[PDB]
Amino acid sequence: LDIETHNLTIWDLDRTFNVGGFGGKETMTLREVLSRLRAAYTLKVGSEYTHILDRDERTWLQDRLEAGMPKPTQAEQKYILQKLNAAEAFENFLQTKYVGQKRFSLEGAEALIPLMDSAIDTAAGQGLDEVVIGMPHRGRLNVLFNIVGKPLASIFNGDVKYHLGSEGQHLQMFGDGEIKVSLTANPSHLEAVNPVMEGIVRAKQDYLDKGVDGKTVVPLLLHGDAAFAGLGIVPETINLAKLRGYDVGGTIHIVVNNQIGFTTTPDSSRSMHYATDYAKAFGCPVFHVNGDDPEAVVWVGQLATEYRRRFGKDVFIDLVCYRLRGHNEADDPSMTQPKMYELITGRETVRAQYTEDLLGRGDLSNEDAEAVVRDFHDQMESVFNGLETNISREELLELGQAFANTPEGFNYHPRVAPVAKKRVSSVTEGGIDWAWGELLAFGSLANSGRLVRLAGEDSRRGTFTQRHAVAIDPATAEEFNPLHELAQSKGNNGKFLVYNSALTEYAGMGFEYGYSVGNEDSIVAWEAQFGDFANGAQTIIDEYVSSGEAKWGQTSKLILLLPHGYEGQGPDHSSARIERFLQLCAEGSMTVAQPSTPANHFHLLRRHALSDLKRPLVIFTPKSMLRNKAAASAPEDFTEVTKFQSVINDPNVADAAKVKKVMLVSGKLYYELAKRKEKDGRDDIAIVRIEMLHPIPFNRISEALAGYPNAEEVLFVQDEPANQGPWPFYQEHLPELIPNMPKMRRVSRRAQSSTATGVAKVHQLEEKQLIDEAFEA
Amino acid sequence: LDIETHNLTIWDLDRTFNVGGFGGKETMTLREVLSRLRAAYTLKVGSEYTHILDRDERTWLQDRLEAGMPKPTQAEQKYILQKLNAAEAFENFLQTKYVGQKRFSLEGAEALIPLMDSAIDTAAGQGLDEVVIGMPHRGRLNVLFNIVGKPLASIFNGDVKYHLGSEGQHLQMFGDGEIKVSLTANPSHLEAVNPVMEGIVRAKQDYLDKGVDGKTVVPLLLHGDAAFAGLGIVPETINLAKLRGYDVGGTIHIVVNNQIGFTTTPDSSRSMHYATDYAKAFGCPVFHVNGDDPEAVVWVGQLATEYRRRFGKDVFIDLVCYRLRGHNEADDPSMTQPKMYELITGRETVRAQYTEDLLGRGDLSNEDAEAVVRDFHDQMESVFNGLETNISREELLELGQAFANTPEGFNYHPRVAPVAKKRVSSVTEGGIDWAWGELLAFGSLANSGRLVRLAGEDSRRGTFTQRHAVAIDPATAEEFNPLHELAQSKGNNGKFLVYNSALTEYAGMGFEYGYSVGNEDSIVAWEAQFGDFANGAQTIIDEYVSSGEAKWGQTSKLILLLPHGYEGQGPDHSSARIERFLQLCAEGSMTVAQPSTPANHFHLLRRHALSDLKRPLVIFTPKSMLRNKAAASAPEDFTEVTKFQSVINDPNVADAAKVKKVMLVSGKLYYELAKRKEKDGRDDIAIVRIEMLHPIPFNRISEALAGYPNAEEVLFVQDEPANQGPWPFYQEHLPELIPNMPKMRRVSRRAQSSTATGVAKVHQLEEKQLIDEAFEA
Ligand SMILES: Cc1ncc(C[n+]2csc(CCOP(=O)(O)OP(=O)(O)O)c2C)c(N)n1
């Protein structure tokens, strides 16, 4: 940036040169060229835009930045001063009338309030419908009073004010526009709101139904500088921006850069030059603005909101400010950073500086000048004053016939063709498999008129090549979605939408929780490749899915589909960790189940979607049992059987008076135990299945055991190790709920620190030993 | 890139222009300029380097890329052909002699083997000590045979071959260099090895002790394209590259870009143009190379290894290849991607293409040509043939006096000065607090001659302003580390190293597990800001810390320090989730403790560091008890008391024959219960503390209860809800280990789905109700 580096000297300043349309001129002097470049790129706004690849969007930014900030009117200037007065008035009320609020102070960063106002007002003039805000603790109550518009009485009267959500309206001072404003709930875990907020926006856009030209709900997301550079959830969520099921038309990002973490400085926080350098990975513009020049801050807010509407991409604003006090209530920040807090202590406020600048440009009259003084006193005085789930024979045949009604000149790939042919025959003959039972449920619900959404890794085809919900023609590469087409022909505007995720668990599951909150009337399901990989979304399970209703009174009906089974494929492909989910359950917080039969899975999904109980559902789904012919279901099981079963008694008992042992079991291990009973001719054993785990169906288990009056012993049989699976939960709780029951006796694998062996011959030997122990006299 | 865009035509091709030293010339024709630019930037190697900010490192890359790939010798050419022959020979043996290996095939990407060889050979010529490799499943057994150098017998004979680690030597064909080569263990969870591998390299560099000019252990890290763009752990780990405690001199990254995930294409995987676009966020160079030109691949390997040694930064290679077969053993990839697998099926191999190119440039003689044919047949034939922990009075006084031996013209900040003065007096008078007990332990061990490392968020000062292990002078900003200086004066080369992390839990804890594996003789500890935030590193707890010894036989002695207590500060600042850690324990896999007294914490840390048992330690550390004066310890407790105590019996019992109730407790709640016993004069109650949780000290608990022979009842008292804390574990296991014990009776908070309330008045009412219930007759 020095003229010496380009072989130019002081002797060239008044010579004329060809500049090729720079500043709308063909010729210019070096003195004039340097003036313009310094006015555009070196004052209170610093821009990064030349890394963008499209020529049209690079030229749009270039023309606006080199034209400069327009000179604001007197009316505009006084409106910026009134917002700064309100911001500072509220900070003073909080610090004086209440205690332990020093942690949550906005002092140093009061220009945030006029920046957020500029963006929301620009959106109202564009004609859009809503703005959804997500943010951390710092400045939250200030945003509730000055941006959402809640009364003071409402703010100051489970969980705290600093974590609950709110709604309000924003009218436009110098226009005729209105817009809704919403604030999202969040935990103390930094950046965990990022994917949840994005999902809420997509659900709201889908409900308005305005097409690709729409995208009329704006996401505004606030970060801190240390958290933005450090935590990996931030760039994981930005990567979903342009994908098919996840696009929301761009996100406006504000990073509040107060040059300190807690007791940590930027040198020990990041290996990037600026905190906002992830923008250069995704091809998006960055604006750096000085937080002590309020006219420049309101311009950057306007320019960012205009860039989002024109190009539909993400935009990043870096607001450079400082932190006046320490993070703790009684803690000295000079203890660790003494040199920085020499510059901070005993400054003038941004309000004071701006008032002095307006009263010294001589624009204002005598009457006008008195008013500016009186406004701050005004703001201060104001603040200190029996449900059946079966379908009809006719409905079932129609669902089957959807896989035959192929569009003109579409053919199926020849490994997919025989799957389609069996779906059409099965609804009369029999032999319905797991995958076809699941799709018959989601299809029936879309016909009634609901929006059904399914998302996860390789979810269109299926991980185990079992689903085939969208088919592709090998010749033409044309897509067909049979059940979506049937739904849109019944005339209740139903939809079946199926999407393939990116390789993420945290961002993926977070996005589907958000969708459930932003449309109460939708049916949403997230699937995992294997249930073993759901530990990479533990923050979302612990802080939102299991605990949200108790904390904030926020309800969800999300379905988690997690594969599970001990089939000899190693420790990272065997367990979805049942024990961990049952540890998190209390007073019916969520429903947990493991069904054995395709028809029972059908009845569970339909009960959840047609009930008034608004809590999540966790289903442990099979892998090998997907293709077992003893598991398949008849059509009368979807048409004559009315309800979902929580306990299934033994089908193969000749005489109940001869039974002496009773085995309790849950999942795929039933079919192995049943095989052995038939081979050995054991008429003294009865095998009983538990389909629902939490809540405990204790009345149905009691009825079952009452039916065998000469039973001496009760065994609990599971595949999982003795410190894993459902045994720990059941040995604690079941004896107190059924007093007359005999003492239970465990039969399982040995307790261990891993999930399962990695040697396949050891797996086969363990399984033999388990079943022999069960039948041993 | 079209000449029309720059207002130039065909009529300018033979006119001469000033080019300013391009191609080492002052003048040149447009025809010559276009030739050179196309030869340098548009053939088999594509470069991204102009985003780099330093002028010297931009010019170094520019000069090498525009000079071009050097013409390789005949000997060099035949050595590249022999490596491709070996690679393809081994793939054929695996596919024919064994089954279910189609998932793990390298067919399509055989140029990986000569790329990795080029880099390792270049490192050996630079004079460096070791190369550490981390990678996923694809190509692993090929790398074990052709790069590490294991025999076939060793490979083909718990867990599988695809997850265990190995060591070997690499000699240099045309030189006199040797270098060690190591391969790291890993789970199926993609990208979880990234932080663990980096930590292993830093531990090995620290042991060699060669200073800043050293950095002589090279990290080589292999990724897949979908995982690299999608999972957030990747950019979280790159952000640690230039930080103080974490820098290893650069990382060479290889992304194998086979243009497909599992059944998912790049369109539905990322929102970036290339998968390697995170490089532009961190200011590092990227080389894209064609995987069907083996001479270009060996050049890029050399250039990347030379760039790391000169500039000490990260470097990224994108190897563009394809995937010949499907990911499953029996699965058709044309089912989903039919158009892509029209181009793939029925191609010539990279080995075949390169042989045809050498035999058609006429360099080779008749004798030389016969040899090239016979080499592939040769490679094929070959493959198919009573420990006391106290310190002395003198050692204790010396540790105290370290906080007085300030360097010349250093003064303490005046809020830190009185802490230092009390540390010097306490070692004679009394009143030693928690923090000073912890540092007395780490200090004593550094004096004996060990390397002690402590890392975490705000760990130098402390989160609760309690530690002060490095002090800063407010006048000069000069640092002092008293205990490091005492260690280096005793002449056993001991060190006390303390570092402030970035705001990360996954990358942070991963790095400290790696350090423990790469130096068995170090004492390492990771601290969390609050124990509630450790759920963001659940992948590392589940897959490495709790399970590594059982899976792979890999041992660690890592210390986790997790703050814990119910003090009325909300649901994300109360519980470290004890219940979850005790669920993961079996057959002494790790030690779990919650000490009540500073001296007992001292004795636990020293027992762990001087034992032969090589397993992790999880300590639940206090918050409010840090400054409680009833908790402080006398000097005789560090000097006359010999061992760590697992159970502590009641100090305040006049007559043991009068006791009728016995309360068991663990942690800070002791001090509340003890206060109430004194106030009410209860000589019928005895309060007994459990300091170690797993393993269960059942012999010591039995001895304690035997001492009170007229005890009618036993209460278990905890602050946590009834489905959380240590009660679930103890109600299952303790009755079977002590048969004669009376039936236990719980006294706790009610079971719930969250951790704790968010209203402070409700917390105080709950605590009163808990203690009243305990003492109720
Ligand atoms: C996931 C997570 N990790 C760590 C913390 C602990 N924590 C609370 S506040 C804080 C500092 C954040 O600093 P920054 O993002 O720079 O913003 P500031 O509060 O200074 O505005 C940290 C690390 C947390 N709340 N959540």
Ligand SMILES: Cc1ncc(C[n+]2csc(CCOP(=O)(O)OP(=O)(O)O)c2C)c(N)n1
């Ligand atoms: C954390 C995690 N998430 C998901 C998976 C499931 N998974 C196994 S292989 C695979 C595909 C990875 O594709 P890519 O990284 O492009 O490499 P390729 O195997 O095609 O070489 C996935 C998603 C996993 N193993 N770990």
Ligand SMILES: [Mg+2]
């Ligand atoms: Mg900050």
Ligand SMILES: [Mg+2]
């Ligand atoms: Mg790939």
